[PDB]
Amino acid sequence: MLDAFAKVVAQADARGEFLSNTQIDALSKMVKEGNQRLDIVNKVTSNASAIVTNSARALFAEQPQLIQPGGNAYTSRRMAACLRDMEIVLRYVSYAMIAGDSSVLDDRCLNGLRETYQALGTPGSSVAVAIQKMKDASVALANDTTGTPIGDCSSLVAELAGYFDRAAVSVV
Amino acid sequence: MLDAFAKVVAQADARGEFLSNTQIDALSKMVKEGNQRLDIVNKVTSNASAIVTNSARALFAEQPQLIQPGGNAYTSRRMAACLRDMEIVLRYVSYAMIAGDSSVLDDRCLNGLRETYQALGTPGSSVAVAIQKMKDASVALANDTTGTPIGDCSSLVAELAGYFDRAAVSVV
Amino acid sequence: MKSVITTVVSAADAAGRFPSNSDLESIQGNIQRSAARLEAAEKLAGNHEAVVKEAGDACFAKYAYLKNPGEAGENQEKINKCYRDVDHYMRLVNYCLVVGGTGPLDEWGIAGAREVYRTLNLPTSAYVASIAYTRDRLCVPRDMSAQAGVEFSAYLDYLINALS
Amino acid sequence: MKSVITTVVSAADAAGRFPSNSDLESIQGNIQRSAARLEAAEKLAGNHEAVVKEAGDACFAKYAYLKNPGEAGENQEKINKCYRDVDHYMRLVNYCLVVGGTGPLDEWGIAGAREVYRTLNLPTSAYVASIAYTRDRLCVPRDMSAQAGVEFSAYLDYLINALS
Amino acid sequence: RLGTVSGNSSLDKLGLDKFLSESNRAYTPRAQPGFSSEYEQIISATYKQLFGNAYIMDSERAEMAKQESMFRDGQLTLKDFCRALAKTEQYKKRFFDSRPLYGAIELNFKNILGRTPDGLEHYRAKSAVYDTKGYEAFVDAFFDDGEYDEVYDDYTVPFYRGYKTEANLSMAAFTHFFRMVRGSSTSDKANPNSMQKDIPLNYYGITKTPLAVIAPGAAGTAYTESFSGTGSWQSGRAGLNAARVALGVPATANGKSFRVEVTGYTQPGFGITAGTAVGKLYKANKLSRYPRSNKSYVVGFDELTPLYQRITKNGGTIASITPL
Amino acid sequence: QILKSTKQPFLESQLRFNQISIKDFIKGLVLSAPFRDLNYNVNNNYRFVEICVQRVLGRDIYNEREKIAWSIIIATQGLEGFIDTLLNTQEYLSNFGDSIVPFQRRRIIPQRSKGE
Amino acid sequence: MLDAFSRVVVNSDAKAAYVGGSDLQALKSFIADGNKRLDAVNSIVSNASCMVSDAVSGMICENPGLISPGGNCYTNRRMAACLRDGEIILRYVSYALLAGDASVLEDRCLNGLKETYIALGVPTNSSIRAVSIMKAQAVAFITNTATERKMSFAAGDCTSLASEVASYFDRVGAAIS
Amino acid sequence: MLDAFSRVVVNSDAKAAYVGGSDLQALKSFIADGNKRLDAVNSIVSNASCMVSDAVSGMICENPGLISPGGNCYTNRRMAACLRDGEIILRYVSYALLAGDASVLEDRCLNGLKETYIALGVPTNSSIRAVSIMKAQAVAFITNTATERKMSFAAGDCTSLASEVASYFDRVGAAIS
Ligand SMILES: *CC[C@H]1/C(=C/c2[nH]c(/C=C3N=C(/C=C4\NC(=O)C(CC)=C4C)C(C)=C\3CCC(=O)O)c(CCC(=O)O)c2C)NC(=O)[C@@H]1C
Ligand SMILES: *CC[C@H]1/C(=C/c2[nH]c(/C=C3N=C(/C=C4\NC(=O)C(CC)=C4C)C(C)=C\3CCC(=O)O)c(CCC(=O)O)c2C)NC(=O)[C@@H]1C
Ligand SMILES: C=CC1=C(C)[C@@H](Cc2[nH]c(/C=C3N=C(/C=C4\NC(=O)[C@H](C)[C@H]4CC)C(C)=C\3CCC(=O)O)c(CCC(=O)O)c2C)NC1=O
Ligand SMILES: C=CC1=C(C)[C@@H](Cc2[nH]c(/C=C3N=C(/C=C4\NC(=O)[C@H](C)[C@H]4CC)C(C)=C\3CCC(=O)O)c(CCC(=O)O)c2C)NC1=O
Ligand SMILES: C=CC1=C(C)[C@@H](Cc2[nH]c(/C=C3N=C(/C=C4\NC(=O)[C@H](C)[C@H]4CC)C(C)=C\3CCC(=O)O)c(CCC(=O)O)c2C)NC1=O
Ligand SMILES: C=CC1=C(C)[C@@H](Cc2[nH]c(/C=C3N=C(/C=C4\NC(=O)[C@H](C)[C@H]4CC)C(C)=C\3CCC(=O)O)c(CCC(=O)O)c2C)NC1=O
Ligand SMILES: C=CC1=C(C)[C@@H](Cc2[nH]c(/C=C3N=C(/C=C4\NC(=O)[C@H](C)[C@H]4CC)C(C)=C\3CCC(=O)O)c(CCC(=O)O)c2C)NC1=O
Ligand SMILES: C=CC1=C(C)[C@@H](Cc2[nH]c(/C=C3N=C(/C=C4\NC(=O)[C@H](C)[C@H]4CC)C(C)=C\3CCC(=O)O)c(CCC(=O)O)c2C)NC1=O
Ligand SMILES: C=CC1=C(C)[C@@H](Cc2[nH]c(/C=C3N=C(/C=C4\NC(=O)[C@H](C)[C@H]4CC)C(C)=C\3CCC(=O)O)c(CCC(=O)O)c2C)NC1=O
Ligand SMILES: C=CC1=C(C)[C@@H](Cc2[nH]c(/C=C3N=C(/C=C4\NC(=O)[C@H](C)[C@H]4CC)C(C)=C\3CCC(=O)O)c(CCC(=O)O)c2C)NC1=O
Ligand SMILES: C=CC1=C(C)[C@@H](Cc2[nH]c(/C=C3N=C(/C=C4\NC(=O)[C@H](C)[C@H]4CC)C(C)=C\3CCC(=O)O)c(CCC(=O)O)c2C)NC1=O
């Protein structure tokens, strides 16, 4: 797996190039927003249980065919499998958030996930619904100003939403 | 795997035939050149490091696109993979040389090798070049008269060159 | 999802060409009409429980035989599904007003509707009566602007031409 | 003959559908651009004697080897055909300014031009030099309006991207 | 049924069954005015073949009305009907607008020509037409070559021919046909390898490497795997699916080698028991026992019968066993 | 013995091409050629079985009788038969499976510093 | 095909003349009432479905021989074909009215319609009766002269567009006469 | 094909909610600088031909191994294929910049480009180097920061569109990484 620094390092190695000065400013401005990057993942980690539980609760309030008998969440073990599947994606999105790019998300979370749900008979579009319900639940929580100095961190919020989108289209 | 005796034994078994007398002379003349067969593999084994190293050195002197940055031998680990890939073929050719036929060469060296290099992006024609550079490096060394009684062993040399040719066309 | 942008990008993609001056010229018309087409959409959004209320019973005042036994509107949940069937169409009209083209209508409301209403034995004339009642008592200075009313009414009779 | 109207009627015809609201919406953009695209066209119409004159010799000032023996511009009628070849392109630029799309250019000037200029051994770099000279000394307040220069220059480098 | 022995035939058990029955030849040139059952059968067969089993609703079928029109007059099947059906906005929306170009190429070799391309040289002959002259000449490249008028009649519907030799392709494209055509109950939004959004074969048709034919309707037929090519020159990951080469010492130590693909892995049903084990049910990592279904293996000869115990007792189902 | 004469370049090249799994890699390492003269020729069958239980199964022996019991498979079936019947137990498959490197299972108590 | 803008381009291309400011005024007058042209086209597309059905029903109620056994609009298939035949004509006339030039139904609709109908046995009298009814409906919609339906427009005159759309319907009947 | 308008429709359709006046302001702000978006798209289409050729020439002059014998851009056919490969990417990024939504190159361009290049043997480092060069050219054209070419615009700020088009280029390299 690679973070954002190791990615440009692999780019520069695979053509044998010294890193230009402009790439050094591109990395220095990632260093510049380090505390703001850390605040987002800290706020997501502190609310991770309520994110998954409220998103899952709102999923079955509007898709009640899943928890009714015969559905793909009608058990206690299929239901516990669903909650733990949502925590997996919330975990790996937060890994990709501090990595700076989605290598660890694509590599050991999303690779082969669509085929898994097709083999199990799990409806992948309803997984895609639950992922976008966690997405804005975490985005609206990352725009909360309690416990942080007041400033701008909107581009990082868009970067965080991009990972949830990438995980959402990877599962249908 | 089979040697040359077990091959005619499998031929004779699969039609339930007793071995005719003429096949016994065909095997006795393989017994007749046993010391000359052993001398060839002994001379190849005693020079195995210099065969691989000189053939590999002459390969990049004329194909310098491989060791320049971006090539499929531009690392220290891809380069060490290439040298060790050449030793593999030199090992299994020498196995087939004392076996008398190319069952062990075809069976556990060349089977699936073209598909492996196609999956890795390794240029198989440049592997075929290096195999023929080891071929006459070993052939010209097997015609050396130091340490052996003076006699004829030319048909065995042609048999040795046949295995290198079979490994060369199996990799493109 | 047919719209102004969706048409010109598929035309340029089928020709295999870059966006030309005529492609950029068509989006200026979208810019000039957004200031009359969006008013109608949120006026419908802010008022839609009363407009579907007067359309659904106008459907039943014209065809009072629908509440007969053996019909499509016999008991109460059929009528509740009828009000829902009308609200679904008004939501799609709001969506086509927001998009700019008729994409949401022929994607989710029109395509396959004749097969559904035939085998489920629903009369399409009772559908078009409620839409025609909504179109005919749209009153253009009060309810909307002068230009938003023509944009709102042009999507309404698209449904009437599609269902009949 | 690609234009704003020609695109939307071909799309509605391939879909087999009537003109929708997005079809009528694109023509409003044509109406809004007609008042800046037509003055560039007649400004070119009223001035094309000198615009083609300064471009053709700018072609030869850059590439003076074209007047060598054995070349494309050896004697006088080749140069007279070169000025004609330039005037043909400026007329098509005027036509695309009048139409609205790039239809007259890729119908009569672009399609098949690479086969002609290769076998007749004409350098396309000498064609694009005269067009680039015309684009670079278009001077936006005096020669046109501010918006007409935007429109006139966008068709010029369409030729440069098509020939190179 | 299923198998290769019982009815003394093999190709109908692979789901090719309805495609061996009819011909749809369109006998008289124009439509006789007065009568219309025969031509409605031909129209429905052309929609079934050209769109590959999708539901053109009547609201959508009302706009190929001008194309059914001239076909009922004196105009062709192959040059008027099937060509103009590929240039309408119901075909373009499904097989061009949602796909990339190389997804649109294989979906036209399936619909129009009834086969699969092999190699790059079949793809790049058709993408070079698109990149120069647009989609409208990209469509005519399938009809106007030396392929359509030599295997198809002017009035027959273009049947599937990718499985037979008389389409003189190869043997790798024989097995690529059963990735595209999985029986008579399947469509293009409908197979798992392409859900009207991707390229169905991408790595496999470019490189011409063949894909083991799992028959549809078999026990364990929903086997599909992802792609992550190993090796560090292309910087890929090792550990996703098994190899297909049988290379080194474990090729022929422990006999000849095989490649088993198994598909259905579930969290209950591991242990040596009939029921699930209850308790905490996941480890500290809380992933799974098998973190993905559709695993494949490379096994020797006398490791095959214990691997067969280990697959089936643990709830897995074997898709295909090929030798190596 | 992570010296170079002990390293097998060929099990490694087959492991990173997904031809063999981790369980087959452990089987290749126990039956490997430097393991058969640096650990097998220097023990009896009784010490060698507790070596192979501690390093493959990740646990200590239960008592003396487990060593005496498993000691017979080595003698009558070779190292190959012994390592097959060891790697196919329920204990190995329930803990490591076919795709996890073995490790010393539950060595230290979690409160305490000093463990086993 | 050809709109009103490309028509003057193909007119001045045979001249090899630049499009100058003399003949451009016919094009800026085309822009000056483009809103009236869109307002006119919308009023026809809005109720084309009643326009077609009323025209075929009026043609049948004028000539009751078409629904006789062996008539050209006898069975359900032939009647559906007639309602399909009229709608295509209305669609192409709407295309030509939007484009400002008749050259879109010159070659896509009327090119070969003449002998198609007499290869089919379609009677040519009822075809021009139906489009004459459709023309009378279309002029009654460009102006607000329709009886039970009134659409809200801005005030002004639209007689030029009504004469233009009548001239688009005259050549349909002339192509099949 | 989803533009910026259909994106909020598919967002509010899962809600089964009418598009109200709260979330409409993000759409009227999209209309308020539509002229800036057209002014931005025109400046890229205007010199795409220099943009592609400069990008592949810079990728080659940075990595001279591609033009060695057996390199991926060695022969004339492979070099023409590379110049063809880059132009399609620029075309789809221009489509997404015009549409205001990235959903036109997620499914028509990048869906399957990842494994196409590694079935072909196309090196993934040089492709992201080339589109990074194309991104640096595109941001230098949305703003008037290019060196030898200056285009005349009305005064104002276009940094939002430059960040948007940069965000359209990073997912291209991320799709093939
Ligand atoms: C919101 C809940 C949705 C849902 C979930 C669901 N999932 C499963 C089964 C599996 N899910 C996975 C996925 C992963 N495993 C991993 O290790 C990782 C880490 C990268 C992921 C993303 C796997 C492998 C399985 C199968 C293993 C298993 O059986 O647990 C199940 C079924 C569980 C069962 O059938 O016993 C459900 C119900 N399904 C829904 O309907 C919701 C939309
Ligand atoms: C002269 C060097 C040429 C070259 C070699 C090269 N090979 C690889 C990678 C692999 N080679 C094999 C081949 C075998 N593995 C075996 O076990 C056997 C025994 C029968 C053979 C013949 C395999 C499986 C691989 C992949 C595993 C691995 O990664 O090592 C590599 C790439 C190594 C890497 O990418 O990390 C190279 C460079 N390549 C050349 O360019 C020379 C022509
Ligand atoms: C222990 C773990 C750990 C963390 C969680 C971070 C948290 C942290 N963030 C900031 C500092 C900051 N944190 C933020 C982030 C935000 N502010 C907002 O108003 C938004 C709600 C949110 C955007 C996502 C911003 C924007 C600043 C800089 C203040 C500013 O310029 O606006 C600072 C002060 C140092 C500085 O000035 O950068 C610290 C200590 N650092 C750590 O070591
Ligand atoms: C310890 C391992 C071991 C070996 C390496 C062989 C080596 C060996 N070779 C020969 C004997 C021989 N070896 C060779 C081979 C050659 N002579 C040449 O001139 C060529 C260079 C080369 C051909 C490849 C020949 C040809 C003879 C027989 C002499 C003759 O008739 O020419 C003899 C004497 C016995 C005999 O007469 O056959 C021995 C001991 N035997 C072994 O036990
Ligand atoms: C997204 C767009 C969308 C729609 C437009 C509707 C369309 C629609 N309506 C109904 C279903 C129905 N629609 C009606 C409505 C009516 N019946 C009448 O007599 C009147 C004509 C009218 C009320 C005024 C009724 C009564 C049913 C139930 C019919 C039945 O199940 O018996 C169904 C079948 C599924 C169901 O029972 O709900 C569908 C798909 N639904 C949608 O999801
Ligand atoms: C309707 C659109 C239209 C065009 C764009 C031109 C395109 C065009 N130019 C020429 C033909 C030519 N065009 C040129 C022009 C030039 N040669 C140069 O060295 C310079 C690059 C440039 C002058 C600046 C010349 C010299 C010929 C004559 C070539 C020859 O016949 O040897 C021909 C061949 C027929 C002929 O000889 O006239 C054609 C089709 N003609 C058209 O009808
Ligand atoms: C219809 C198309 C059309 C054009 C594109 C221009 C092109 C053009 N420019 C000039 C003529 C000129 N063009 C310029 C250039 C400029 N003038 C300035 O004040 C700025 C510094 C700069 C604009 C950025 C100058 C300074 C002259 C005067 C003579 C010269 O120096 O070339 C001339 C010669 C006739 C004249 O003097 O007007 C022509 C044909 N004219 C046209 O009719
Ligand atoms: C014997 C059978 C018979 C009929 C069925 C009717 C049909 C009919 N209606 C009109 C004539 C018309 N028909 C319409 C059409 C409509 N008006 C609307 O408000 C609706 C939107 C739309 C469908 C009803 C219009 C607008 C006119 C012109 C004004 C008018 O007469 O109402 C004409 C034209 C007369 C002519 O010039 O030939 C005919 C034949 N009349 C008949 O003689
Ligand atoms: C692009 C332009 C275009 C058209 C205009 C139509 C033209 C057209 N009409 C018909 C075919 C027909 N058209 C009519 C219509 C009529 N006959 C009458 O008596 C009435 C006067 C009139 C209805 C108002 C009938 C009755 C048929 C006969 C179909 C049949 O024979 O079953 C046919 C051939 C058979 C068929 O397609 O069904 C064609 C090509 N199609 C096109 O593609
Ligand atoms: C994209 C969709 C689109 C439309 C549907 C039309 C809508 C439309 N119509 C007119 C405007 C008008 N429309 C008419 C037309 C008529 N008035 C009559 O009384 C006659 C019945 C009828 C003749 C056909 C007239 C006379 C005007 C006034 C402006 C003018 O005369 O050009 C205007 C400009 C003034 C206004 O805001 O109302 C617009 C935007 N234009 C569009 O851009
Ligand atoms: C070793 C080989 C080598 C080259 C060939 C050049 C190529 C080149 N140019 C630019 C960078 C650029 N390239 C252009 C492109 C253009 N400018 C224009 O005015 C024309 C319209 C258009 C085609 C020439 C622009 C606008 C920039 C950004 C500003 C600039 O540097 O000029 C970059 C980006 C640097 C980066 O971020 O990686 C590169 C590699 N530089 C090199 O190092």
Ligand SMILES: C=CC1=C(C)[C@@H](Cc2[nH]c(/C=C3N=C(/C=C4\NC(=O)[C@H](C)[C@H]4CC)C(C)=C\3CCC(=O)O)c(CCC(=O)O)c2C)NC1=O
């Ligand atoms: C709709 C989206 C779409 C695309 C993006 C392209 C993608 C694409 N590129 C190539 C094919 C290729 N693309 C490249 C390009 C490159 N290799 C390099 O080393 C450079 C990094 C880079 C140029 C900048 C090369 C060299 C080929 C090889 C063609 C060949 O093998 O002859 C091929 C297959 C073979 C062919 O068509 O020629 C395809 C499908 N096509 C599409 O339809």
Ligand SMILES: C=CC1=C(C)[C@@H](Cc2[nH]c(/C=C3N=C(/C=C4\NC(=O)[C@H](C)[C@H]4CC)C(C)=C\3CCC(=O)O)c(CCC(=O)O)c2C)NC1=O
């Ligand atoms: C159909 C073709 C078509 C176009 C080519 C554009 C042309 C265009 N651009 C702008 C207008 C503008 N364009 C810009 C954009 C910029 N200014 C800068 O200094 C930056 C370099 C760049 C950012 C990308 C700005 C800032 C305005 C002023 C109006 C606004 O801010 O929205 C305007 C409105 C005001 C005017 O008349 O100039 C128009 C019509 N619009 C179109 O309809």
